[PDB]
């Protein structure tokens, strides 16, 4: 959840907002070790419920998210239903566990490609055009992350937009991401420069991957 | 419906057969002028019902067809239901009126392309990949006619098969068609040659379009 003024500004300027719970457990092995554990349900519930209670009157918020990169666990299913029960006005999405689980109203993959399948075990990223028509599938598809804009990037961006426009149920996506997470450091002359992972002595670090 | 031996040979050699009623009213304006007319329902019904009564014990027949190129009339809907009621063991398909009407269990377009839409008014031919995931659509897609093999042709044939293999609900199609409808004529020396429309003084005619 963002600084509260963010939603007021999106209300007034007009942007659609996905409001997302402060839950990510990417580094767990496997990713759902905590989110499938009922012992972590109370901590998770407060991150979801206290978000909804704060932001539910903002028109700009059109979709709730259960967080990111936390696999798919029983705690997600419980909290998905809680939101559906408490606020039927907004769809609930969540990408973990393969982007099309029982805890999401929207097929919301990250970096699924337009035409090319990436058939990973358990969590495949299907071609977005293919994903829509898998046997029994009827949901809209909106990528929660695509077109990773790291450095000299956005090659192939036009391919996404051609597909978005051609397929009714391909309803867009959210670029990753808006702003480089570089930080200003100063050299011996007091001149500013842009720093990334490791430039503060931080170790282990993931270098430029924050930009 | 074919010569009765055809089905016996398909049973024994092993080919899946679409058995099709002898109904085509292509030259009508509009195409459904007769098939929407209850006056033509008795004549159409006999073409459907007597086919089923004749061929329903052949294992090679896996799908019934209501005919071809006769638009979509109320008579098709009546006869679709008649088959569903009398023989539940076989799907019913019919292409007329846009390939995805209430008179067909299978989306069965003719010459719909792989990636390119042809948005004709009333009866568009969508890209087959796009067609599958149109809002609310759930049926399999099997082209009743595709890859028109006229003369030096079948360009782009590989494109269909890549898509057939990638998409579960794209379950193939029927090439148009098997054999040139050319006829034998003879020159002054008795040498045979291949003839097409117009070569018999037949007029109006559609020339080489029979091959
Ligand atoms: Na779209
Ligand atoms: Na990053
Ligand atoms: Na297929
Ligand atoms: Na022809």
From Swiss-Prot, chains A, B:
It comes from Escherichia coli (strain K12). Changing residue 209 to A: Decreases the stability of the loop 794-804. Homotetramer. Na(+) binds at residue 209. The gene is lacZ. Belongs to the glycosyl hydrolase 2 family. Mg(2+) 1 binds at residues 24, 26, 69. It comes from the Bacteria. Mg(2+) 2 binds at residue 205. The active site is at residues 69, 145. Substrate binds at residues 69, 145-148. The chain holds residues 394 to 604 of 1024 of the full protein. The lineage of its organism: Bacteria, Pseudomonadati, Pseudomonadota, Gammaproteobacteria, Enterobacterales. This is Beta-galactosidase. Induction: By allolactose.
